[PDB]
Homo-oligomer: A and B are copies of this chain.
């Protein structure tokens, strides 16, 4: 239960991320490593496109490329589904609707493989406008804070989430991305089904000045809230 999940994330945990995607026909792959410290609701990753140049803005992949590292306050630990599902893990599926543009559909499996927390993903994007903010690469290289609204999904012994990302556009404006999320345990064991709450996210995108490959250094701070 609480102690079981808390134990698996007691200190700093190594992370591995793998993604294969296809957006409007452009195939690409991303691989990344890093670590997370749920004690501080912190996570840091260096993600690299191993197929060359990324066909879409890096910011559009931030949400796809580890909610188990969220910092749940003591009074809210009974609501931490993500950690309660470990190490077996859970599948995280999403559909992302980019306002007035295409959409991504993703499926990921996150769980431990030894001492390492792994996130393997498959992404498919369709109907993007060649001249849009996505394929046109018109999004600024940055990120804002958002809240991930969560509710239990007892039918699937998991949870559902919904939130809208605001991607700042170069020279002004915002490109919204509506996220519909579903998380289902991989195992058949018992999990912590939560009462409604949300995860408060804050992220910063950076670059490794010495790296030649197309990449993204991502930093996230996550804290659960919404319950007194």
Contacts and interface: CB of A to CB of B under 8 A. Distances in A.
Contacts of A41: 206
A204 B43 CA distance: 12
Contacts of A42: 206
Interface residues of A, number: 21
A39 interface: yes
Interface in A195-212: 200, 202-206, 209
Interface in A155-179: 168
Contact of A143 (B39, B40, B145, B205): B145
A99 B43 CA distance: 34
Contacts of A39: 209
Nearest to A204: B202
A-B residue pairs, 6 tightest by C-beta: A142-B145, A144-B144, A202-B204, A204-B221, A142-B202, A206-B221
